[PDB]
Design a protein around this ligand. Structure first.
Ligand SMILES: COc1cc2cc(OC)c1OCCCCCOC(=O)[C@@H]1CCCCN1C(=O)[C@H]2C1CCCCC1
Length: 128
């Protein structure tokens, strides 16, 4: 389904071109502007492990997930991926462990060497 389509059709948005972060835009945003490092970013997301054993959604909390882009608050893949998004964009990201929780993982919630998948909606972003 959605993850395999990203394997197949996803754009590699890493600087190193190591397929560590793959993206498909599923619903296109508006505006030419993408978030700059430092911005306060507001999203909705659904995420899961590739092993199928954990799911997590911002909607579970009945509120947007807010974070400051590039300011160390989220996994590298998010800092990379959300910088590419436009206001109102929905994107799919498939993420190798090097851009998520690495060999150590984040136990017990994230195992070692975990691949992760996200659907992300960029709701808004405002300047520091
Ligand atoms: C809502 O709680 C979460 C959610 C994720 C991971 C977490 O800790 C590892 C976690 O507890 C700590 C708070 C979030 C820590 C950082 O999370 C992240 O960087 C990424 C991107 C922002 C949304 C959350 N997130 C996660 O890795 C989730 C994760 C939850 C398990 C299923 C796959 C996603």
């Amino acid at each position: 389904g959605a993850p395999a389509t990203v394997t197949e059709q996803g754009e590699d948005i890493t600087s190193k071109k190591d397929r560590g972060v793959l993206k498909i835009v599923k619903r296109v945003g508006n505006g030419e502007e993408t978030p700059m490092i430092g911005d306060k970013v507001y999203v909705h997301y659904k995420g899961k492990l590739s092993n199928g054993k954990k799911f997590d959604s911002s909607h579970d909390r009945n509120e947007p997930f807010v974070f400051s882009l590039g300011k160390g608050q989220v996994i590298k893949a998010w800092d990379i991926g959300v910088a590419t998004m436009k206001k109102g964009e929905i994107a799919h990201l498939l993420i190798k462990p090097e851009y998520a929780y690495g060999s150590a993982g984040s136990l017990p919630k994230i195992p070692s060497n975990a691949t992760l998948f996200f659907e992300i909606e960029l709701l808004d972003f405002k300047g520091e």
